[PDB]
Protein backbone atom coordinates (compact mmCIF):
# COMPACT_ATOMS: atom_id res chain seq x y z
CA UNK A 1 0.00 0.00 0.00
CA UNK A 2 1.54 3.24 -1.16
CA UNK A 3 0.38 6.85 -0.74
CA UNK A 4 2.39 10.10 -0.86
CA UNK A 5 3.78 10.77 2.64
CA UNK A 6 1.58 13.79 3.50
CA UNK A 7 1.38 14.88 7.13
CA UNK A 8 -0.90 17.86 6.57
CA UNK A 9 -4.49 17.48 7.69
CA UNK A 10 -7.39 18.62 5.46
CA UNK A 11 -9.15 21.76 6.83
CA UNK A 12 -12.68 20.40 6.86
CA UNK A 13 -13.27 22.08 10.20
CA UNK A 14 -12.79 25.40 8.42
CA UNK A 15 -15.63 24.47 6.08
CA UNK A 16 -18.14 22.80 8.37
CA UNK A 17 -17.48 24.89 11.54
CA UNK A 18 -16.94 28.17 9.56
CA UNK A 19 -18.08 31.35 11.23
CA UNK A 20 -20.30 32.15 8.25
CA UNK A 21 -21.57 30.46 5.12
CA UNK A 22 -22.06 32.36 1.88
CA UNK A 23 -25.37 33.10 0.25
CA UNK A 24 -26.58 30.51 -2.23
CA UNK A 25 -26.37 33.00 -5.10
CA UNK A 26 -22.67 33.53 -4.37
CA UNK A 27 -21.55 30.24 -2.91
CA UNK A 28 -17.95 29.75 -1.82
CA UNK A 29 -15.65 27.24 -3.49
CA UNK A 30 -12.78 26.12 -1.30
CA UNK A 31 -9.96 24.01 -2.68
CA UNK A 32 -8.74 21.09 -0.61
CA UNK A 33 -5.31 19.75 -1.56
CA UNK A 34 -1.99 18.31 -0.36
CA UNK A 35 -3.51 16.89 2.85
CA UNK A 36 -4.89 13.87 4.67
CA UNK A 37 -8.65 13.62 4.50
CA UNK A 38 -10.29 11.74 7.32
CA UNK A 39 -13.87 11.28 6.22
CA UNK A 40 -14.88 9.09 9.12
CA UNK A 41 -15.29 12.22 11.17
CA UNK A 42 -17.79 13.76 8.80
CA UNK A 43 -19.61 10.50 8.21
CA UNK A 44 -19.84 9.42 11.84
CA UNK A 45 -20.85 12.88 13.00
CA UNK A 46 -24.51 12.77 14.01
CA UNK A 47 -24.92 16.53 13.68
CA UNK A 48 -25.76 16.24 9.99
CA UNK A 49 -29.36 16.07 8.82
CA UNK A 50 -28.25 14.45 5.60
CA UNK A 51 -25.15 12.89 4.10
CA UNK A 52 -26.06 11.73 0.63
CA UNK A 53 -23.38 10.42 -1.74
CA UNK A 54 -23.98 10.26 -5.46
CA UNK A 55 -20.41 9.36 -6.35
CA UNK A 56 -19.02 6.72 -4.02
CA UNK A 57 -20.05 5.03 -0.80
CA UNK A 58 -19.16 7.32 2.17
CA UNK A 59 -17.24 4.61 4.00
CA UNK A 60 -14.89 3.98 1.06
CA UNK A 61 -13.68 7.58 1.09
CA UNK A 62 -10.84 6.69 3.42
CA UNK A 63 -9.30 4.02 1.14
CA UNK A 64 -9.94 5.93 -2.06
CA UNK A 65 -8.20 9.24 -2.84
CA UNK A 66 -8.45 12.18 -5.17
CA UNK A 67 -6.65 14.58 -7.49
CA UNK A 68 -8.59 17.31 -5.75
CA UNK A 69 -11.62 17.99 -3.59
CA UNK A 70 -13.73 21.12 -3.70
CA UNK A 71 -16.06 22.23 -0.96
CA UNK A 72 -18.98 24.32 -2.10
CA UNK A 73 -20.29 26.14 0.98
CA UNK A 74 -23.57 28.05 1.23
CA UNK A 75 -26.89 28.63 3.05
CA UNK A 76 -30.23 27.40 1.73
CA UNK A 77 -33.78 26.98 2.99
CA UNK A 78 -34.58 23.51 4.40
CA UNK A 79 -37.08 22.66 1.65
CA UNK A 80 -34.37 23.41 -0.92
CA UNK A 81 -32.14 20.56 0.29
CA UNK A 82 -33.84 18.30 -2.25
CA UNK A 83 -32.65 20.51 -5.11
CA UNK A 84 -28.99 19.91 -4.50
CA UNK A 85 -28.56 16.77 -6.50
CA UNK A 86 -27.76 15.64 -10.06
CA UNK A 87 -30.89 15.52 -12.21
CA UNK A 88 -32.80 18.08 -10.12
CA UNK A 89 -34.41 21.37 -11.12
CA UNK A 90 -35.85 24.28 -9.14
CA UNK A 91 -35.13 27.86 -8.18
CA UNK A 92 -31.76 26.99 -6.70
CA UNK A 93 -30.86 24.16 -9.02
CA UNK A 94 -31.54 26.41 -12.00
CA UNK A 95 -30.50 29.93 -10.91
CA UNK A 96 -28.03 29.61 -8.02
CA UNK A 97 -26.31 26.28 -7.72
CA UNK A 98 -26.27 23.78 -10.54
CA UNK A 99 -24.64 20.37 -10.26
CA UNK A 100 -23.55 18.17 -13.18
CA UNK A 101 -25.98 15.33 -13.73
CA UNK A 102 -22.94 13.07 -13.56
CA UNK A 103 -21.81 14.68 -10.30
CA UNK A 104 -19.36 12.67 -8.26
CA UNK A 105 -19.33 13.34 -4.56
CA UNK A 106 -21.43 13.90 -1.42
CA UNK A 107 -23.96 16.50 -0.27
CA UNK A 108 -23.86 17.19 3.45
CA UNK A 109 -26.31 19.48 5.22
CA UNK A 110 -27.59 20.41 8.66
CA UNK A 111 -30.02 22.77 10.35
CA UNK A 112 -28.72 26.17 11.43
CA UNK A 113 -31.96 27.28 13.10
CA UNK A 114 -30.06 27.59 16.37
CA UNK A 115 -27.12 29.38 14.75
CA UNK A 116 -27.99 31.68 11.85
CA UNK A 117 -31.68 32.38 12.48
CA UNK A 118 -32.58 35.72 14.21
CA UNK A 119 -35.25 37.75 11.08
CA UNK A 120 -31.87 37.01 9.44
CA UNK A 121 -32.05 38.38 5.90
CA UNK A 122 -28.33 38.20 5.12
CA UNK A 123 -28.78 35.28 2.75
CA UNK A 124 -29.74 35.95 -0.84
CA UNK A 125 -30.94 33.69 -3.63
CA UNK A 126 -31.68 34.44 -7.25
CA UNK A 127 -35.36 34.96 -7.86
CA UNK A 128 -35.12 36.16 -11.45
CA UNK A 129 -32.78 35.23 -14.29
CA UNK A 130 -33.09 34.87 -18.08
CA UNK A 131 -31.73 31.32 -18.36
CA UNK A 132 -30.46 28.41 -16.30
CA UNK A 133 -26.92 28.09 -14.93
CA UNK A 134 -24.15 25.87 -16.15
CA UNK A 135 -22.71 23.38 -13.61
CA UNK A 136 -20.65 25.12 -10.92
CA UNK A 137 -21.40 28.57 -12.33
CA UNK A 138 -21.24 31.55 -9.96
CA UNK A 139 -23.55 34.33 -11.27
CA UNK A 140 -36.46 48.46 -17.13
CA UNK A 141 -33.50 50.59 -18.17
CA UNK A 142 -32.13 51.19 -14.68
CA UNK A 143 -35.61 51.74 -13.27
CA UNK A 144 -37.07 48.93 -11.21
CA UNK A 145 -40.85 48.55 -11.07
CA UNK A 146 -43.66 46.44 -12.52
CA UNK A 147 -42.16 43.66 -14.65
CA UNK A 148 -38.69 45.21 -13.86
CA UNK A 149 -37.59 43.18 -10.89
CA UNK A 150 -34.47 43.17 -8.77
CA UNK A 151 -32.90 39.69 -9.33
CA UNK A 152 -32.03 38.82 -5.70
CA UNK A 153 -34.31 37.92 -2.81
CA UNK A 154 -33.47 37.38 0.85
CA UNK A 155 -34.59 34.56 3.11
CA UNK A 156 -36.46 35.62 6.24
CA UNK A 157 -34.84 33.09 8.54
CA UNK A 158 -36.33 33.06 12.03
CA UNK A 159 -35.99 30.62 15.00
CA UNK A 160 -39.76 30.22 14.85
CA UNK A 161 -39.77 28.82 11.24
CA UNK A 162 -38.65 22.93 9.52
CA UNK A 163 -38.81 23.56 5.71
CA UNK A 164 -38.39 27.28 6.37
CA UNK A 165 -35.43 26.90 8.71
CA UNK A 166 -31.96 27.76 7.36
CA UNK A 167 -29.65 24.92 6.47
CA UNK A 168 -25.93 24.94 5.99
CA UNK A 169 -24.88 22.83 3.07
CA UNK A 170 -21.47 21.69 1.96
CA UNK A 171 -21.06 19.87 -1.29
CA UNK A 172 -17.90 17.88 -1.71
CA UNK A 173 -16.97 17.56 -5.35
CA UNK A 174 -14.37 14.89 -5.96
CA UNK A 175 -12.10 14.69 -8.95
CA UNK A 176 -11.06 11.06 -9.07
CA UNK A 177 -9.43 10.91 -12.49
CA UNK A 178 -6.35 8.70 -12.64
CA UNK A 179 -3.83 11.47 -12.14
CA UNK A 180 -1.55 12.43 -9.19
CA UNK A 181 -3.52 12.38 -5.95
CA UNK A 182 -3.21 15.19 -3.45
CA UNK A 183 -6.07 14.47 -1.02
CA UNK A 184 -5.72 10.95 0.49
CA UNK A 185 -7.22 9.18 3.46
CA UNK A 186 -5.59 8.29 6.80
CA UNK A 187 -3.82 5.23 5.52
CA UNK A 188 -0.41 4.08 6.59
CA UNK A 189 1.85 3.20 3.71
CA UNK A 190 4.21 0.25 3.72
CA UNK A 191 7.39 -0.67 1.88
CA UNK A 192 7.37 -1.69 -1.75
CA UNK A 193 8.53 -5.16 -2.67
CA UNK A 194 9.72 -5.85 -6.20
CA UNK A 195 9.82 -8.96 -8.41
CA UNK A 196 7.23 -10.83 -6.37
CA UNK A 197 3.44 -11.34 -6.68
CA UNK A 198 1.76 -8.77 -4.46
CA UNK A 199 -1.64 -7.25 -3.78
CA UNK A 200 -1.03 -3.58 -4.47
CA UNK A 201 -2.75 -0.26 -3.79
CA UNK A 202 -1.39 2.90 -5.41
CA UNK A 203 -3.35 6.00 -4.43
CA UNK A 204 -6.56 3.96 -4.23
CA UNK A 205 -5.82 1.97 -7.41
CA UNK A 206 -5.75 -1.71 -6.65
CA UNK A 207 -4.89 -4.97 -8.35
CA UNK A 208 -2.63 -8.00 -8.15
CA UNK A 209 0.64 -8.36 -9.99
CA UNK A 210 4.40 -8.27 -9.99
CA UNK A 211 6.04 -4.86 -9.66
CA UNK A 212 9.28 -4.48 -11.62
CA UNK A 213 11.72 -1.77 -12.67
CA UNK A 214 10.88 -0.13 -15.99
CA UNK A 215 12.20 2.29 -18.56
CA UNK A 216 8.87 3.91 -19.40
CA UNK A 217 9.18 7.63 -19.82
CA UNK A 218 6.20 8.94 -17.90
CA UNK A 219 5.69 12.66 -18.28
CA UNK A 220 5.79 14.85 -15.10
CA UNK A 221 1.98 14.95 -15.02
CA UNK A 222 1.40 11.25 -15.74
CA UNK A 223 0.78 9.08 -12.71
CA UNK A 224 -0.55 5.96 -14.40
CA UNK A 225 -0.09 4.20 -17.73
CA UNK A 226 -2.61 1.93 -19.45
CA UNK A 227 -2.88 -1.17 -21.61
CA UNK A 228 -5.19 -1.83 -24.58
CA UNK A 229 -7.81 -3.21 -22.19
CA UNK A 230 -7.58 0.08 -20.23
CA UNK A 231 -6.06 -1.85 -17.35
CA UNK A 232 -3.06 -0.46 -15.54
Amino acid at each position, epitope marked *: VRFPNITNLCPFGEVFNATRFASVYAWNRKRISNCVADYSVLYNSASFSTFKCYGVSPTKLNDLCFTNVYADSFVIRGDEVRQIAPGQTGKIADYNYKLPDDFTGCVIAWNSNNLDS*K*GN*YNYLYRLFRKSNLKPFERDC*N*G*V*E*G*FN*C*Y*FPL*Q*SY*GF*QPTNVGYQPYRVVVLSFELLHAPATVCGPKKSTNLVKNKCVNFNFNGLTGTGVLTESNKKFLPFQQFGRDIADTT
Partner: antibody, heavy 118, light 109 residues
Framework: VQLVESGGDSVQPGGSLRLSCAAA????????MNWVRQAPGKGLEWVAN????????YYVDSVKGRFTISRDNAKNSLYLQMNSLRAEDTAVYYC?????????????WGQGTLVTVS | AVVTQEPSLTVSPGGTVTLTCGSS?????????PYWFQQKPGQAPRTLIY???NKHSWTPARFSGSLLGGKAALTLSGARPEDEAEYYC??????????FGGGTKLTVL
Protein backbone atom coordinates in the same frame (compact mmCIF):
# COMPACT_ATOMS: atom_id res chain seq x y z
CA VAL B 1 -31.85 56.83 -11.66
CA GLN B 2 -32.05 60.49 -10.78
CA LEU B 3 -34.87 62.99 -10.65
CA VAL B 4 -33.87 66.60 -10.38
CA GLU B 5 -36.62 69.03 -9.54
CA SER B 6 -36.38 72.79 -9.24
CA GLY B 7 -38.26 76.07 -9.60
CA GLY B 8 -39.21 76.47 -5.94
CA ASP B 9 -38.71 80.01 -4.65
CA SER B 10 -40.27 82.69 -2.43
CA VAL B 11 -43.31 83.99 -4.28
CA GLN B 12 -46.38 86.12 -3.61
CA PRO B 13 -49.95 84.70 -3.26
CA GLY B 14 -52.31 85.18 -6.16
CA GLY B 15 -49.45 84.74 -8.62
CA SER B 16 -48.09 81.64 -10.31
CA LEU B 17 -45.02 79.45 -10.33
CA ARG B 18 -43.64 76.95 -12.82
CA LEU B 19 -41.82 73.96 -11.35
CA SER B 20 -39.85 71.46 -13.40
CA CYS B 21 -38.17 68.02 -13.24
CA ALA B 22 -35.36 66.64 -15.35
CA ALA B 23 -34.79 62.93 -15.81
CA ALA B 24 -31.30 61.47 -15.81
CA UNK B 25 -29.87 57.96 -16.13
CA UNK B 26 -33.08 56.50 -17.57
CA UNK B 27 -35.61 56.88 -20.38
CA UNK B 28 -38.13 59.62 -19.71
CA UNK B 29 -40.82 58.49 -22.15
CA UNK B 30 -41.43 55.04 -20.72
CA UNK B 31 -42.66 56.05 -17.29
CA UNK B 32 -45.32 58.20 -15.64
CA MET B 33 -44.19 61.42 -13.96
CA ASN B 34 -45.65 62.31 -10.54
CA TRP B 35 -45.80 65.38 -8.33
CA VAL B 36 -46.30 65.23 -4.56
CA ARG B 37 -46.13 68.11 -2.11
CA GLN B 38 -45.43 68.28 1.59
CA ALA B 39 -46.17 71.21 3.86
CA PRO B 40 -43.62 71.41 6.71
CA GLY B 41 -44.89 69.53 9.75
CA LYS B 42 -47.51 67.75 7.60
CA GLY B 43 -47.84 64.48 5.70
CA LEU B 44 -47.72 63.98 1.94
CA GLU B 45 -50.31 65.31 -0.48
CA TRP B 46 -50.77 63.80 -3.90
CA VAL B 47 -50.83 66.63 -6.40
CA ALA B 48 -50.65 65.64 -10.00
CA ASN B 49 -49.44 63.19 -12.59
CA UNK B 50 -49.04 62.70 -16.31
CA UNK B 51 -49.15 59.69 -18.58
CA UNK B 52 -46.03 58.43 -20.31
CA UNK B 53 -46.86 60.03 -23.67
CA UNK B 54 -48.58 63.15 -22.28
CA UNK B 55 -52.00 62.12 -23.64
CA UNK B 56 -53.58 62.12 -20.18
CA UNK B 57 -53.14 64.25 -17.07
CA TYR B 58 -54.32 63.70 -13.51
CA TYR B 59 -54.91 66.05 -10.61
CA VAL B 60 -56.10 65.91 -7.05
CA ASP B 61 -59.41 67.75 -7.06
CA SER B 62 -57.98 70.49 -4.78
CA VAL B 63 -55.63 71.73 -7.54
CA LYS B 64 -57.91 71.01 -10.46
CA GLY B 65 -58.18 73.93 -12.86
CA ARG B 66 -55.15 75.59 -11.26
CA PHE B 67 -52.37 73.14 -12.05
CA THR B 68 -51.21 72.23 -15.57
CA ILE B 69 -48.65 69.63 -16.67
CA SER B 70 -46.80 69.64 -19.95
CA ARG B 71 -43.64 67.90 -21.07
CA ASP B 72 -40.87 67.71 -23.62
CA ASN B 73 -39.78 64.18 -24.41
CA ALA B 74 -36.77 65.46 -26.32
CA LYS B 75 -35.42 67.14 -23.18
CA ASN B 76 -36.35 64.28 -20.88
CA SER B 77 -38.26 66.67 -18.64
CA LEU B 78 -41.69 67.82 -17.47
CA TYR B 79 -43.18 71.04 -16.18
CA LEU B 80 -45.84 71.72 -13.56
CA GLN B 81 -47.36 75.16 -13.63
CA MET B 82 -49.55 76.27 -10.78
CA ASN B 83 -51.80 79.30 -11.11
CA SER B 84 -53.66 81.24 -8.41
CA LEU B 85 -51.07 80.01 -5.95
CA ARG B 86 -52.34 80.23 -2.37
CA ALA B 87 -50.51 81.65 0.67
CA GLU B 88 -51.43 78.44 2.45
CA ASP B 89 -49.55 76.39 -0.17
CA THR B 90 -46.12 76.32 1.42
CA ALA B 91 -44.64 72.94 0.70
CA VAL B 92 -41.80 71.00 -0.78
CA TYR B 93 -42.67 69.69 -4.21
CA TYR B 94 -41.16 66.39 -5.17
CA CYS B 95 -40.68 64.74 -8.56
CA UNK B 96 -41.28 61.02 -8.54
CA UNK B 97 -40.92 58.35 -11.22
CA UNK B 98 -43.74 55.87 -11.55
CA UNK B 99 -42.70 52.54 -13.01
CA UNK B 100 -45.42 50.52 -11.34
CA UNK B 101 -48.43 48.76 -12.85
CA UNK B 102 -50.84 51.69 -13.16
CA UNK B 103 -48.39 54.60 -13.17
CA UNK B 104 -50.36 56.46 -10.45
CA UNK B 105 -47.60 56.55 -7.79
CA UNK B 106 -43.84 57.10 -7.93
CA UNK B 107 -41.08 54.66 -6.92
CA UNK B 108 -38.01 56.84 -7.41
CA TRP B 109 -37.94 60.19 -5.67
CA GLY B 110 -35.97 63.40 -6.13
CA GLN B 111 -34.80 65.74 -3.37
CA GLY B 112 -37.64 68.25 -3.53
CA THR B 113 -37.92 71.95 -4.32
CA LEU B 114 -39.33 74.32 -1.71
CA VAL B 115 -42.18 76.62 -2.57
CA THR B 116 -42.89 79.36 -0.06
CA VAL B 117 -45.76 81.73 -0.57
CA SER B 118 -45.81 85.09 1.30
CA ALA C 1 -60.75 60.92 -1.21
CA VAL C 2 -60.30 59.82 2.38
CA VAL C 3 -57.47 57.68 3.66
CA THR C 4 -56.70 57.10 7.32
CA GLN C 5 -53.77 55.76 9.33
CA GLU C 6 -52.85 55.00 12.94
CA PRO C 7 -51.14 58.30 14.07
CA SER C 8 -48.16 56.55 15.65
CA LEU C 9 -46.65 53.22 16.65
CA THR C 10 -43.93 52.44 19.17
CA VAL C 11 -41.84 49.29 18.99
CA SER C 12 -39.06 47.83 21.14
CA PRO C 13 -35.83 46.97 19.26
CA GLY C 14 -36.25 43.56 17.61
CA GLY C 15 -40.05 43.71 17.98
CA THR C 16 -42.58 43.53 15.19
CA VAL C 17 -44.59 46.41 13.77
CA THR C 18 -47.97 46.56 12.08
CA LEU C 19 -48.42 49.91 10.32
CA THR C 20 -51.92 50.21 8.86
CA CYS C 21 -53.77 52.20 6.15
CA GLY C 22 -57.18 52.21 4.53
CA SER C 23 -59.89 54.07 2.66
CA SER C 24 -63.16 55.34 4.09
CA UNK C 25 -65.19 53.36 1.55
CA UNK C 26 -65.13 49.81 0.20
CA UNK C 27 -62.00 47.87 1.14
CA UNK C 28 -58.34 47.80 0.26
CA UNK C 29 -57.45 45.13 -2.24
CA UNK C 30 -54.76 44.69 -4.88
CA UNK C 31 -56.99 46.81 -7.15
CA UNK C 32 -55.86 49.89 -5.19
CA UNK C 33 -52.27 49.00 -6.03
CA PRO C 34 -51.20 50.36 -2.58
CA TYR C 35 -47.89 52.16 -2.03
CA TRP C 36 -45.90 52.79 1.15
CA PHE C 37 -43.21 55.43 1.63
CA GLN C 38 -40.59 56.06 4.30
CA GLN C 39 -39.42 59.53 5.22
CA LYS C 40 -36.57 60.30 7.56
CA PRO C 41 -35.98 63.91 8.73
CA GLY C 42 -34.32 65.98 6.00
CA GLN C 43 -35.01 63.31 3.36
CA ALA C 44 -37.40 62.88 0.46
CA PRO C 45 -40.01 60.09 0.85
CA ARG C 46 -38.68 56.77 -0.39
CA THR C 47 -41.03 54.14 -1.73
CA LEU C 48 -40.62 50.82 -0.02
CA ILE C 49 -43.69 48.96 -1.26
CA TYR C 50 -45.42 49.29 -4.60
CA UNK C 51 -48.37 47.66 -6.31
CA UNK C 52 -49.60 46.08 -3.05
CA UNK C 53 -46.69 43.88 -2.07
CA ASN C 54 -43.70 44.42 -4.33
CA LYS C 55 -40.60 45.40 -2.39
CA HIS C 56 -37.88 47.68 -3.77
CA SER C 57 -34.19 46.73 -3.85
CA TRP C 58 -33.31 49.57 -1.48
CA THR C 59 -35.83 48.39 1.10
CA PRO C 60 -34.57 46.19 3.98
CA ALA C 61 -36.19 42.77 3.76
CA ARG C 62 -37.31 43.20 7.34
CA PHE C 63 -40.21 45.19 5.82
CA SER C 64 -43.24 43.41 4.35
CA GLY C 65 -45.95 44.92 2.12
CA SER C 66 -48.81 42.74 3.34
CA LEU C 67 -52.55 43.36 3.35
CA LEU C 68 -54.83 42.91 6.36
CA GLY C 69 -58.63 42.81 6.78
CA GLY C 70 -59.48 45.13 3.88
CA LYS C 71 -56.55 47.38 4.78
CA ALA C 72 -53.02 48.03 3.54
CA ALA C 73 -50.14 47.45 5.91
CA LEU C 74 -46.42 47.74 6.21
CA THR C 75 -45.08 45.34 8.75
CA LEU C 76 -41.71 44.64 10.28
CA SER C 77 -40.22 41.31 11.39
CA GLY C 78 -37.92 43.13 13.82
CA ALA C 79 -37.53 46.91 14.00
CA ARG C 80 -34.22 48.70 14.44
CA PRO C 81 -33.33 52.33 15.49
CA GLU C 82 -32.46 52.96 11.84
CA ASP C 83 -36.17 52.58 11.04
CA GLU C 84 -37.33 55.66 12.92
CA ALA C 85 -39.29 57.49 10.25
CA GLU C 86 -42.69 58.73 9.28
CA TYR C 87 -44.48 56.35 6.98
CA TYR C 88 -47.08 57.24 4.44
CA CYS C 89 -49.59 55.19 2.47
CA UNK C 90 -51.09 55.95 -0.90
CA UNK C 91 -54.12 54.34 -2.56
CA UNK C 92 -55.44 54.57 -6.16
CA UNK C 93 -59.16 54.90 -6.92
CA UNK C 94 -61.24 55.46 -10.07
CA UNK C 95 -58.05 56.44 -11.85
CA UNK C 96 -54.59 57.85 -11.25
CA UNK C 97 -55.72 60.30 -8.57
CA UNK C 98 -54.09 58.82 -5.53
CA UNK C 99 -54.85 59.83 -1.96
CA PHE C 100 -52.36 59.83 0.90
CA GLY C 101 -53.16 58.87 4.46
CA GLY C 102 -52.41 61.14 7.41
CA GLY C 103 -49.08 59.44 8.06
CA THR C 104 -48.05 56.96 10.73
CA LYS C 105 -45.04 57.85 12.86
CA LEU C 106 -42.89 54.89 13.83
CA THR C 107 -40.40 55.17 16.67
CA VAL C 108 -38.14 52.68 18.41
CA LEU C 109 -38.15 52.26 22.23
Amino acid sequence: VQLVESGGDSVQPGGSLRLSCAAAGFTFSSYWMNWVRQAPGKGLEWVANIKQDGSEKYYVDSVKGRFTISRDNAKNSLYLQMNSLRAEDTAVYYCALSSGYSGYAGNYWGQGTLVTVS
Amino acid sequence: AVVTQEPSLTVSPGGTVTLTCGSSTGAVTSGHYPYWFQQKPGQAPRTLIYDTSNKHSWTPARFSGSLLGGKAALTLSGARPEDEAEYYCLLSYSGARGVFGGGTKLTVL
